[PDB]
Amino acid sequence: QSYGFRPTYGVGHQPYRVVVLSFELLHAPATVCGPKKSTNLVKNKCVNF
Amino acid sequence: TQSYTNSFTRGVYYPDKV
């Protein structure tokens, strides 16, 4: 059965929503990443990566 | 139509992408 909202309702009775962003951070091929710009692949030297 | 056989050492796959 269906609910029903109305503007005149008070706090709590107002409508709310929910979102669940499931993630997976194990060592696997990446499909989504942040806006971190990619630098150059310096090789053969002690560097942080 | 039906029959029964054995899988000696079959049914193996990499658990994770590592």
Swiss-Prot record, chain A:
Query: Tell me, how does this one assemble?
Result: Binds to host ACE2. RBD also interacts with the N-linked glycan on 'Asn-90' of ACE2. Cleavage of S generates a polybasic C-terminal sequence on S1 that binds to host Neuropilin-1 (NRP1) and Neuropilin-2 (NRP2) receptors. Interacts with host integrin alpha-5/beta-1 (ITGA5:ITGB1) and with ACE2 in complex with integrin alpha-5/beta-1 (ITGA5:ITGB1). May interact via cytoplasmic c-terminus with M protein. May interact (via N-terminus) with host bilirubin and biliverdin, thereby preventing antibody binding to the SARS-CoV-2 spike NTD via an allosteric mechanism.
Please give the name of this protein. Spike protein S1
Q: Positions of the region Disordered?
A: 27-49
> What is its biological role?
Attaches the virion to the cell membrane by interacting with host receptor, initiating the infection. The major receptor is host ACE2. When S2/S2' has been cleaved, binding to the receptor triggers direct fusion at the cell membrane. When S2/S2' has not been cleaved, binding to the receptor results in internalization of the virus by endocytosis using host TFRC and GRM2 and leading to fusion of the virion membrane with the host endosomal membrane. Alternatively, may use NRP1/NRP2 and integrin as entry receptors.
What outcome is documented for mutating G4S in this protein?
A: In strain: Omicron/BA.1
Q: What is the effect of changing H27P?
A: Increased resistance to human covalescent sera neutralization
